[PDB]
């Protein structure tokens, strides 16, 4: 028992160390998620002010063009041309109803124009991000697809000291930040259900009376029937 006593005296130190690191990370996720909620509520009030200052003097407020798109794949894997098939691989949309967050810059929009009959994209809200990260957000840990259960498992994954909780990931996704790529390449591609209530027409664009293409924030009610 001379060897077995030193092991449980070292296991005794690793229990109080994980109990300290659990409550230390509970506070700095309680504190950091309050900071972001003040930003989400306060900066939302700022644009309500500027759009009244615009409207009162007959001016217009050109809103900032959206920097983040949510992109779900709505057609299956059959009969796909090799240019369209590679872009659907480079967006990590390899199965039907897989969904990814992408940036909305000029390199990414010219990839989304080339595969529009296969995808339905649009502009997500704050609740669309946090429903996808909480309910159906998983991570690539040890090359495996493991579901987000605690913020310790997120902090063990990214090792960034800026991404320590699940509100850090919905921060970097919703407001692009310095680490949009590392958060989204951190997660597995989101695998959603088919939408309840149906799809109107898979084979035509959203303007034509169907479903593919861009929805200039209407993609939230379509994803709210899937998450």
């Amino acid at each position: 028992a001379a060897f077995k006593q030193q092991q449980t005296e070292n296991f005794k130190k690793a229990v109080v160390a994980r109990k300290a690191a659990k409550a230390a990370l509970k506070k700095t996720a309680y504190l950091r998620a309050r900071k972001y909620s003040r930003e989400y509520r306060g900066a939302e009030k700022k644009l309500v002010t500027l759009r009244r200052q615009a409207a009162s003097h007959g001016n217009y407020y050109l809103e900032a063009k959206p920097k983040v798109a949510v992109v779900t794949r709505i057609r299956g894997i059959a009969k796909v041309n090799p240019k369209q098939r590679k872009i659907l691989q480079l967006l990590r949309l390899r199965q039907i109803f897989n969904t990814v967050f992408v940036k909305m810059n000029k390199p990414m929009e010219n990839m989304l124009r080339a595969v529009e009959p296969y995808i339905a994209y649009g502009y997500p809200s704050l609740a669309t991000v946090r429903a996808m990260v909480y309910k159906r957000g998983y991570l690539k840990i040890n090359g495996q697809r493991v579901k987000i259960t605690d913020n310790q498992m997120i902090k063990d994954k990214y090792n960034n000291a800026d991404i320590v909780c699940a509100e850090d990931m919905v921060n970097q996704i919703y407001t692009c930040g310095k680490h949009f790529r590392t958060v989204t390449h951190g997660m597995w591609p989101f695998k959603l259900a088919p939408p309840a209530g149906g799809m109107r027409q898979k084979r035509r664009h959203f303007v034509e009376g169907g479903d593919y293409g861009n929805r200039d924030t209407l993609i939230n009610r379509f994803l709210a029937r899937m998450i």
């Binding site: 299956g76 894997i77 796909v80 098939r85 691989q89 390899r94």
Partner: protein, 197 residues
């Protein structure tokens, strides 16, 4: 339902077990699979993975090759440290062409009867892998060597031998038979001894 097109082509061939029927290689694979997981040393990772390998992929080393690369490391060793233990996963053969050699300490998977004699006559020592698991159990102060795979007959026959650039040897039991047409410029053409890339 997943579009996994080039996903079987990313797979490689690993073979975690050995094909050998020797019951003493299986004891070293019992010992070095233990040390590979239970130690952070990259030595035991490589010594375990090279012990699995086939007898063609455990090409042997010569004793005059161990005596030259240990010399070129003992040139820039401070002489207060002794020398590494040379370890090869494979066979050490003797070299006739190198008479006198220093007192080096060699761990091999098998020695010749004459490579064993010329090591211990130089003041050296022939070790073994159970004996290397006791002195330096993680490979501290070792020098891991392989032995040469080019220069084999089979490697010299690998190729087309009649496309330009290729200097491989033809499979011919008769040496003076395949020497005429396509191998001399007077006999209608001769394959170009050099081709760019």
């Amino acid at each position: 339902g997943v579009d996994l097109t080039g996903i079987s082509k990313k797979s490689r061939v690993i073979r975690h077990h050995t094909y050998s029927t020797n019951p003493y290689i299986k004891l070293l694979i019992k010992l070095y699979k233990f040390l590979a997981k239970r130690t952070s040393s990259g030595f035991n990772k490589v010594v375990y993975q090279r012990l699995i390998k086939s007898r063609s992929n455990r090409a042997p080393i010569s004793l005059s090759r161990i005596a030259v690369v240990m010399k070129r490391k003992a040139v820039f060793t401070a002489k207060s440290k002794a020398a590494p233990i040379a370890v090869v996963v494979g066979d050490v053969l003797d070299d006739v062409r190198m008479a006198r050699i220093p007192a080096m300490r060699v761990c091999a998977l098998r020695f010749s009867k004459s490579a064993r004699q010329s090591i211990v006559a130089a003041g050296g020592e022939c070790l073994t892998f159970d004996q290397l698991a006791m002195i330096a159990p993680t490979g501290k102060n070792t020098y891991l060597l392989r032995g040469r795979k080019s220069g084999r007959e089979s490697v010299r026959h690998f190729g087309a031998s009649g496309v330009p650039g290729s200097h491989s040897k033809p499979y011919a039991t008769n040496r003076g038979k395949e020497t005429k047409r396509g191998r001399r410029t007077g006999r209608s053409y001769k394959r170009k001894a050099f081709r760019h890339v």
